[PDB]
Structure formats: C-alpha cells, structure tokens
Design a binder for this molecule. Structure first.
Ligand SMILES: Nc1nc2c(ncn2[C@@H]2O[C@H](COP(=O)(O)OP(=O)(O)O)[C@@H](O)[C@H]2O)c(=O)[nH]1
Lengths: 431, 155
C-alpha cells in the first residue's frame, strides 16, 4: 500500500485542496514549478504517496480538479503552486449547480462523472500499490455534495477493495448564505454512511468561532478558514507522507479507528492556534500542547467531547522533543479522564511522532477523535432538516430533477438511527 | 382558473403577473391543495415587492394551511429579514401554533437566523410557548449548541 490518488471538487473542496497542496508541497520540498528544492531526505522516503514522477525531477501531484462552474479553474491558476498540476487532469464543467444536490447527482454531474472516471482510470493504470482514494469537498452546496456522493458510489462499485477516505466540511447558518443546505447535508450523509470508509468532519461554525474569539479577527474572510483546515490536513496526512510504524497506510489507519462499520465520523483538532503568516516566538511546549489538543477550544467540529466518550483517538506530534514526555502526557490525559473513554476498548489511543514539523511552527500536535459526542453534530442538522422537510420548501428543485422525494425521509430515518447508534455506545459498561 | 397563475407567479418571483392578474379579478388569496396563499410563496422563496404589492391588495397578514403555518412561519424559517420586518409591519402573528407545536421564533431559532429573532422577540415573541415535544424557545438554544441564540433569549 503506497499510492494515494487525490481529488478536489466544488468551490470549498477545490479551495481546501489547493491549500493542502501548498503546505505539503512546501513541507516535502517541491518548488512552485516542480523540482525538488529540499534539504533532508526525510521528505522523499514516502514522497510517492502523493506525487507521480514525470522523469526529469518533475513531481506531478497525482491529483484531479473538477467543478460544474467554468470559473473555479481561474482560482487554480492564481494558486502560487498551481502550475504543477498535470494538464490532462483539468476536467471542468460549464453549467453550474447553484446550491442544488439533485442537479449535481441526477442531472449534470451525471454527465461529467464518466469524464472524471477515465482520468481516474489512467491515474490508477500507473500506480504500483494503489492504496485508496482521498477526497475534499463541502456538504451544503450543490456540486460537491451530490456529484461527490455519486462519484464515490461508482468508484466503490469499480474499486471495492480500496480504502474510501473523505474530508467533508459542514454547513451552518453562521457562514452559509442560502438555506438549501440542511437538505444537501442529509443527502450527503445518507450516501456517506453507506459508501465511505473514513470521514473527517470540519464544521464552519468551529472555524468561525476560532477566527473570532482566538485570532480576534472580527470580520472573518473565506481564506482565514482554508488556512485552519490545511494545517489539520498536513497534521493527519503526516502519517502517510513520512515513514513510521504507526498509521503506515490507510488500511492500518482505519483499523485502529473504526469499531463499527457505520460510525466513522472524526472530529479533528490542532494546537497551537495561529493566524496566517504569524510564527510563534513563545512556541508551545508539551503539557499545554496535549492539554489543549484534547480540550474543545482547538477542535475542528462543533462537538464538545466532554459530553460524549472517545471510542478511539490517534494523536500525532511533529518536531523534535522527548518521546517519554509525549507518551507520559498521553496516558496522563487518559487516566485522569478515564471517565471519557470506553473502558471496553483498551489501548485505544495511539500516538506517533514525526521529525519534520509544520511550517511556521517548531512543535505541533494534531488530533483525530472518533467520539460518541459527534452525534450532537448530527442532532443539529436533523433539526435544521426536520424543520424544513416537514414544510417541503424548495423540494421542486430536487424532486423535479429525477429524484424520489422519499429518498429524503430515507435519509432522516438513516441519520436518526445513526444518532441512536452513537448514543448506544455511550453508556454501555463492560458488563 | 385565475388563482393558479398568481400562486405560481408570486412563487417564481415576478412583477408582471402580480400587477395584472389581480387586475382581472383574480383571487388575491387563492390557495392550492393544502392551503398556501401567494403570500406564503412570495415571502418564502425570497421575493420583496411582491409581498408589498400583495399585502396592500387584500392579502391576509395571518393566513394558515393544513399544518398551521403562516407567512411569518415561512419567512422566519427560510431567512428573509425584510419580509419578516414588512410582514410584521402590517400586524402579523408572532405566537402562532401549528400541528407540530412550533412558533415562528422556534423556526427562526432552529435555522440559526439571529436578527429575525432580534426583531421577532422585540415584537412580542413568547419565550414560554412550547411545542409538541415540550421545549420552550429558550429550550431550543441550550440544545442547539448556539450561544448567540441563547444570549438574545435571556435578554
Ligand atoms: N471554509 C470554507 N467554506 C466554504 C468555502 N466555499 C464554500 N464554503 C461553504 O460551503 C457551502 C456551499 O458553498 P459552495 O462551496 O459554493 O457549494 P458547492 O461547491 O456546490 O459544494 C456554503 O455554506 C459555504 O459556507 C470556502 O472556501 N471555505
């Protein structure tokens, strides 16, 4: 297991994919044009995990970029490291969804899907040990949610033995203009619970809260968040871009993380917290690093884990520090809060350490938390949704595009059983 | 029929079929198969002067349907500030009950539209009005996860 093929679609999804490829193309040492300008070979032992090699010291990001809006691609060309993308891999539609799921799933996405499948095909025809597929998108809009879920379904029925990883973001009436979002959300969840393997959850509400209270940015722009997400992405991909025994490939990653097939919704978190282009003079230590990255003030989804219990956790520390200090603080948080861990799964928190730190930091810490508290995030949507589907607003959009209307209440019964599933494994003692 | 065209006229958002259809004697408040007036549909999907020229042509500023929703239910829920301000300017209802027990403040609160709560409360919203599940309007904010909605409900 080595090669990971990456894909970005939708406004939000393409944006965050760009931020990702920026920070990781710098950390791996690739210059903007596409030649290795690093220092340490630690950045090339597992470089093949995210780049194909065009002969001649050309590191081509094994990636694909899609949108139903013909514009979008412009924001790519202005991306400072955007020329490195392979020409064939640019597949951009020209209709546009306009915040409509069924337009992206049953209508126009149904037309561009087979155009993406062929570039994905010729991407897999040149991979030694193709791991799985790794996607970035958003749930409240039109293109990303729908066309994404359809793509995942077709890849799933053509590649059943390859890991299915998705980095999905959340709508909330704090950043979303329109309010057609509590529909596309529940649809996307309906497909994700049934077709994906791993799934990372990022709430726009959390990023707004962090940008306002911590970073003191009263007027949050739309890149202020992409910074915050790209950081977490480097943190959780460290286990796959650098060598190490823990979380080698994605299969191993899900193995120590997925207790039940459906429950696979994580709540990332990073410490410390910084704005853009602002380094840390008093860079953080260790007890504040782990004392922060397990508190809620640094989590990436609007979910207070102190209400729920952790099923599994995978902590990752980057930089140069003491190993004993790491494992000691880990177990200290564990046993001083053994009331927050399912005692019927033991050895549930796995922590690795990587040498190379992220950019702008000397010591960092990433968090990945499959908690039982994540149901609070799904009890919110099934509230914005049951309050809008009991009224049937905007249903002529979807239903008037080949969609069944009951494929909605299907998703309400599905998610409302999921909530009961996270509540199930919250009070089950080891009897 | 001449009420159908007005119903889908204020729903699709138009200036012409709300100017010279009520001119032919079209039912200004003609409903459909469950009870939506062209004011529910002009306030709902996001249209302005259709609710200013409709609410001055005889539109009931408190009309209901099969489950009990009013034009303020269907404007505080979606999130159109000016349509709730104008719908309240004519004397709408801020404490209307429907078959599931929800009030327009519960719906503007659930959908996280906060200035609609800022004006729905200042125009007399009842924080002690409960629903089919026994939760007040201040009982939506502490279960949501939104502090900015619980700050306006305790002020
Ligand atoms: N953090 C962040 N959120 C975004 C961005 N773009 C869109 N969103 C969110 O995603 C939702 C849908 O917007 P959009 O991306 O245009 O829809 P889509 O591309 O069809 O999925 C909205 O509610 C936004 O809050 C972005 O660049 N950053």
């Amino acid at each position: 297991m080595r090669e990971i093929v990456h894909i970005q679609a939708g406004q939000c999804g393409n944006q965050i994919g760009a931020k990702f490829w920026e920070v990781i193309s710098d950390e791996h040492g690739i210059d903007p044009t596409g030649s290795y300008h690093g220092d340490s070979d630690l950045q090339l032992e597992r470089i093949n995990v995210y780049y194909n090699e065009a002969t001649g010291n050309k590191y081509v990001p094994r990636a694909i970029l899609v949108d139903l809006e013909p514009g979008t691609m412009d924001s790519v060309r202005s991306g400072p490291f955007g020329q490195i993308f392979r020409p064939d891999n640019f597949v951009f539609g020209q209709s546009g969804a306009g915040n409509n799921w069924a337009k992206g799933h049953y209508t126009e996405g149904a037309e561009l899907v087979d155009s993406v499948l062929d570039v994905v095909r010729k991407e897999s025809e040149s991979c030694d040990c193709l791991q799985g597929f790794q996607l970035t998108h958003s749930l409240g809009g039109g293109t990303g949610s729908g066309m994404g879920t359809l793509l995942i379904s077709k890849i799933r029925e053509e590649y059943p033995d390859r890991i299915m990883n998705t980095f999905s973001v959340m709508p909330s009436p704090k950043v979303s203009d329109t309010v057609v979002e509590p529909y596309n959300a529940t649809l996307s969840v309906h497909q994700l619970v049934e077709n994906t393997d791993e799934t990372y959850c990022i709430d726009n509400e959390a990023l707004y809260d962090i940008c306002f209270r911590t970073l003191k940015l009263t007027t949050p722009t739309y890149g202020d968040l992409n910074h915050l997400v790209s950081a977490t992405m480097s943190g959780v991909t460290t286990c796959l871009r650098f060598p190490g025994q823990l979380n080698a490939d994605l299969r191993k990653l899900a193995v120590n993380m997925v207790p039940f097939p459906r429950l696979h919704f994580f709540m990332p978190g990073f410490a410390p917290l910084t704005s853009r282009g602002s380094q840390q003079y008093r860079a953080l230590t260790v007890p504040e690093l782990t004392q922060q990255m397990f508190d809620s003030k640094n989590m990436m989804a609007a979910c207070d884990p102190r209400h729920g219990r952790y099923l599994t956790v995978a902590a990752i520390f980057r930089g140069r520090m003491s190993m004993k200090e790491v494992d000691e603080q880990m177990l200290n948080v564990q046993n001083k809060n053994s009331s927050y861990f399912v005692e019927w799964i033991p050895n549930n928190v796995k922590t690795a350490v990587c040498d190379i730190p992220p950019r702008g930091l000397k010591m960092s810490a990433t968090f990945i938390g499959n908690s039982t508290a994540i149901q609070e995030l799904f009890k919110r949507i099934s509230e914005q949704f049951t309050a809008m589907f009991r009224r049937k607003a905007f249903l002529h959009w979807y239903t008037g595009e080949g969609m069944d209307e009951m494929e909605f209440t299907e998703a309400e019964s599905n998610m409302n059983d999921l909530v009961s599933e996270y509540q199930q494994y919250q009070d089950a003692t080891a009897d | 029929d001449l009420g159908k065209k007005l119903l889908e006229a204020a729903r699709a958002g138009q200036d012409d079929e709300v100017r010279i259809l009520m001119a032919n004697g079209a039912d200004v408040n003609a409903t459909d198969a469950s009870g939506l007036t062209p004011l529910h549909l002009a306030a709902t999907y996001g249209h302005l002067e259709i609710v200013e020229v409709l609410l001055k042509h005889g539109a009931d500023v408190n009309a209901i349907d099969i489950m009990g929703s009013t034009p303020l239910h269907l404007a505080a829920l979606i999130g159109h500030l000016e349509i709730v301000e104008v719908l309240l300017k004519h004397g709408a209802d801020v404490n209307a009950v429907d078959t599931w027990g929800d009030t327009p403040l519960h719906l503007a609160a659930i959908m996280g539209h906060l200035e609609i709560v800022e004006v729905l409360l200042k125009h007399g919203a009842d924080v002690n009005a409960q629903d089919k599940f026994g939760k007040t309007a201040f009982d939506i904010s502490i279960d949501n996860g939104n502090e900015d909605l619980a700050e306006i409900l305790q002020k």
